[PDB]
Design a protein around this ligand. Structure first.
Ligand code: NGJ
Ligand code: ZN
Lengths: 47, 162
C-alpha cells in the first residue's frame, strides 16, 4: 500500500470534467474504514 | 468474530441505507460497460456487520486521526465494491484490498456514488461480469456492496479529469 500525502490522512478525487459525478476517496490504512452494512441487490433493467 | 444482522425493510435504518443507495445512482461515461445499464436497484437484503475487534481497530485509528486534526475525524459513509466483500466483512480492510492501479495510487477506494462502486463488484472495469452468465449488465445475479464508515481526516484535494 502507498502512503498518504505528507500531512494528510486521505485523498479526495474531485470530479473536474463530469458535472454530475460525486467524489471518490482513498485511504492508505485499512483501519480507517469499517464495513458497516452489507447490501445485497440486483440492478434493474430500465423500462 | 463477525455476525450479520438482517435489517427489516420496516426499520428506519434499512430505509435510510436504501435511500442512499438509490439516490446516488448516476449515468457513467462508459455507457454501462463496467457496471451495467440501470437507473435503480432492487434491494434484496441489508445486513448490519458486527465485529468487535474490527470496530475497535476502526475507533482506535479514528481517535488518532481526530487528535492530529483538531478533534475532527471527518467521518463519512461511503460505498465500496469489490469481489472480496466476503473477506472484508470477516477480516477487515487491509493492503490486499488496495487498488494498485488507481488514479490516486495504491490505496483503498470509496465512492459517494453507489453506481461507481457497482462498477467494481465483479472486478476492475467489471471484470468479465457475473460468474454465472459472464454479463457485466446481469439483471439476474445477486450483487453485493459495502456501505462503510470512513475516516478521512485531513484530505488531500485532487482535482481530477473523471
Ligand atoms: C478497486 C475496487 C474499487 C475501486 C473504486 C474506485 N476506483 C473509485 C471509487 C470506488 C471504488 C470502489 O468502490 N471499489
Ligand atoms: Zn448473471
Amino acid at each position: 500500500m502507498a502512503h498518504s500525502p505528507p500531512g494528510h490522512h486521505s485523498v479526495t478525487g474531485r470530479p473536474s470534467v463530469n458535472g454530475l459525478a460525486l467524489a471518490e476517496y482513498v485511504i492508505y490504512r485499512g483501519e480507517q474504514a469499517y464495513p458497516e452494512y452489507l447490501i445485497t441487490y440486483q440492478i434493474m433493467r430500465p423500462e | 468474530g463477525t455476525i450479520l444482522i438482517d435489517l427489516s425493510p420496516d426499520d428506519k435504518e434499512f430505509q435510510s441505507v436504501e435511500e442512499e443507495m438509490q439516490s446516488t445512482v448516476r449515468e457513467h461515461r462508459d455507457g454501462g460497460h463496467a457496471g451495467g445499464i440501470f437507473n435503480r436497484y432492487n434491494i434484496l437484503k441489508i445486513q448490519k456487520v458486527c465485529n468487535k475487534k474490527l470496530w475497535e481497530r476502526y475507533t482506535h485509528r479514528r481517535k488518532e486521526v481526530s487528535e492530529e486534526n483538531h478533534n475532527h475525524a471527518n467521518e463519512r459513509m461511503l460505498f465500496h465494491g469489490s469481489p472480496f466483500v466476503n473477506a472484508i466483512i470477516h477480516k477487515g480492510f487491509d493492503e490486499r484490498h488496495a487498488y494498485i492501479g488507481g488514479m490516486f495510487g495504491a490505496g483503498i477506494y470509496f465512492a459517494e456514488n453507489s453506481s461507481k462502486s457497482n462498477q467494481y463488484v465483479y472486478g476492475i472495469g467489471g471484470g468479465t461480469g457475473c460468474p454465472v452468465h459472464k454479463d457485466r449488465s446481469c439483471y439476474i445475479c445477486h450483487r453485493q456492496l459495502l456501505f462503510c464508515r470512513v475516516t478521512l481526516g485531513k484530505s488531500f484535494l485532487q482535482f481530477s479529469a473523471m
